[PDB]
Every structure is written in structure tokens, then in C-alpha cells.
Design a binder for this molecule. Structure first.
Ligand SMILES: CS(=O)(=O)c1ccc(N[C@@H](c2cccc(Cl)c2)c2ccccn2)c(Nc2ncccn2)c1
Length: 319
């Protein structure tokens, strides 16, 4: 007993077992199937035309026969479209990408309790505000093929996957130390590549790896990164201190996007604070509220700029 969805680009079909998996109290694989069919119909108008539209109204998620009929109508419509295309890879839309990331998560993180994460902006709630805030961050930073993006403490790798599907960075890296999210990240990686191929969508190169971003090997890797993403909101003072030391080796114009600033927003260089990281980096608070109707959230953009320090010294020598 199983259900199959043919790929719109002729990749291997998506296969679901019956009874269909349940994700939470109000979400399951049956809703995922219906939403997948709807998304494919949306971005392939010929499919929407060939598809018997009533089938998306009259379905019963608790009936194997009804769900099989729904999948069959979609599969026949896919077949008709493939016949039309017989007779003579872009990036996913923001809406499709939100769907893909949720789908990759539900097929990968089968036991979300094992994460032991009770925090806001955690893998289990990525769809609520994280996805929208990360999308805003992507639009604001405007990365190119010369950039290298790194998420320090990448969890199950959701930020890396979103950024890789949206930008043309040379490479995207996610580094995670904890065993359970790093293990889940391996499945997220496989599931993302599989689903992106199923939809026929392109993504930039990325790597999800297990490691300690405070290690010796990661010192030079942070120094060579042009865009660091770090959810440091709950980090201790020792980790924060160690991170500022790593950032102090970054190149001019290197950027850090974070949930808590690494230097004060109103930093004023003087003879008593020449040690502070604020001497070599600009910091700005970015808020989507400044057509955002979600949570009143903010993030912090840091830009390596050693002319802050140079200007202080030239001002002492040129009074
Ligand atoms: C100052 S804020 O309160 O508005 C705020 C705002 C943002 C975050 N996180 C997000 C974030 C982090 C860095 C850069 C960006 Cl572009 C976005 C985020 C997105 C995806 C995955 C994890 N994180 C957090 N993070 C947090 N909040 C409570 C407990 C643990 N973390 C807090």
C-alpha cells in the first residue's frame, strides 16, 4: 500500500507509504501531497489546464482510494503534458522554496523531540519567522559569485539550504558541533538534493559539515569567509569573545549577519577602547518593519572596516 507522484521534469517519482506519516497535531504527508500537486500546477500552466480541477476540491485524506484517485489525476495530467512537450533548471520561487524546505524537514527530522530545542528560531519553527527573515536578509546583502557564505552553528542546515537555493555564492557552508542536528543535517542534505531534482530546480553548491567553529582549522576558514551568518542570541560570553577574535582576522568588507550585535551600535573610538572589535567594524541594526506584517524582529549587519582604526590614528597625528 503506497502513493506515487510523478516528477514534472521526469525525475524518479515521489513515493509515500500508506498509512501516510503524521508530522504534528494539524499537519501530515496527505496535506504535503495536496500542496505539492498545487505548487506544480501553479508554475506549469499547461498542467493546470490539463488537470481535472474538481479533484483538488473533492478528496478525503483518510481514504486510500480517494488519495490514490487524486495522485492518479495529477499523474495522468503530468503524462499528457509530457506528450505535448514531446511534440516539440531555474531557481525556485520564494513560495515554492518555503514549501520545499518544509517538505525536506518533514522527510528528514522524523523525531523532532531528539533535537531538545525549546528556543524561538529553532528548526521546528523555521517556517514561522526564520524563513521570512532569512529571505529579507538575502535581499539586503545581495551576494555574488565571488562570495563565500558560512553559517556558524548551522543546526539541521535550513539557513544554508535557503541561501544556496536563492543566491549564486561560490559555495555555502554550514558547520554544526552537536551530534543530533549534524546527523539530521546529513538527511536534510540528501532530501534537499532529491526534492530540488524532483521539481527541476537549481541551487548553488553547498556543504553541511560536522565540526567546531572555534577550532584551529576553522580560524583560517572564518578569515577567508566573505559572509558569516550566526544566530549568536543565546551564546555565552566566552564563545562571543572567541568569535570576535576569529572575526578580527577577516578581510576588509567581510560581513557578519547576526541576532545580537558584536559591537555597540553607537561605538565611539577613544584611547581606552582600542582593543574593542568596534574599532574595525561598522554595525547597523536592520529591521524589516523599517510590506512586513510578521513579528517585530531585527538582525545586525557587521562590515569589516579597518579605516575606523586608521582614521583614529591619522586624527592623533594630524591634530
Ligand atoms: C534580535 S531578535 O530577537 O529579533 C532575533 C532575530 C533573529 C534571530 N534568529 C534568526 C537570525 C539570526 C542571525 C541572522 C539573521 Cl538574518 C536571522 C534565525 C534565522 C534562522 C535560523 C536561526 N536564527 C534571533 N534568534 C534567537 N532568538 C531567541 C533565541 C535564540 N535565537 C533573534
Amino acid at each position: 500500500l503506497e502513493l506515487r507522484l510523478k516528477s514534472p521534469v521526469g525525475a524518479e517519482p515521489a513515493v509515500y507509504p500508506w498509512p501516510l506519516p503524521v508530522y504534528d497535531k494539524h499537519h501530515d504527508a496527505a496535506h504535503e501531497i495536496i500542496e505539492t500537486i498545487r505548487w506544480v500546477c501553479e508554475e506549469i500552466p499547461d498542467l493546470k489546464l490539463a488537470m481535472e480541477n474538481y479533484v483538488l476540491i473533492d478528496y478525503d485524506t483518510k481514504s486510500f482510494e480517494s488519495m490514490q484517485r487524486l495522485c492518479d489525476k495529477y499523474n495522468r495530467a503530468i503524462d499528457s503534458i509530457h506528450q505535448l512537450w514531446k511534440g516539440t533548471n531555474t531557481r525556485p520561487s520564494t513560495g515554492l522554496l518555503r514549501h520545499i524546505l518544509q517538505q525536506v524537514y518533514n522527510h528528514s527530522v522524523t523525531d523532532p523531540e531528539k533535537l531538545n530545542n525549546y528556543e524561538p528560531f529553532s528548526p521546528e519553527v523555521y517556517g514561522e519567522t526564520s524563513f521570512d527573515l532569512v529571505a529579507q536578509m538575502i535581499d539586503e546583502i545581495k551576494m555574488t559569485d565571488d562570495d563565500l557564505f558560512v553559517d556558524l552553528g548551522s543546526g539541521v542546515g535550513q539557513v544554508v539550504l535557503q541561501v544556496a537555493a536563492a543566491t549564486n555564492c561560490k559555495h555555502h557552508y554550514g558547520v554544526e558541533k552537536a551530534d543530533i542536528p549534524a546527523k539530521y543535517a546529513e538527511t536534510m542534505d540528501r532530501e534537499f538534493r532529491k526534492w530540488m531534482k524532483w521539481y527541476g530546480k537549481k541551487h548553488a553548491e553547498y556543504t553541511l559539515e560536522r565540526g567546531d567553529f572555534l577550532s584551529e582549522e576553522w580560524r583560517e576558514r572564518i578569515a577567508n569567509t566573505s559572509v558569516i551568518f550566526v544566530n549568536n542570541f543565546a551564546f555565552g560570553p566566552e564563545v562571543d569573545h572567541q568569535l570576535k577574535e576569529r572575526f578580527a582576522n577577516m578581510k576588509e568588507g567581510g560581513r557578519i549577519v547576526s541576532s545580537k550585535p558584536f559591537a555597540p551600535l553607537n561605538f565611539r573610538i577613544n584611547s581606552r577602547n582600542l582593543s574593542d572589535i568596534g574599532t574595525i567594524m561598522r554595525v547597523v541594526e536592520l529591521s524589516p518593519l523599517k510590506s512586513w506584517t510578521g513579528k517585530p524582529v531585527s538582525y545586525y549587519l557587521h562590515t569589516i572596516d579597518r579605516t575606523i582604526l586608521e582614521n583614529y590614528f591619522s586624527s592623533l597625528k594630524n591634530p
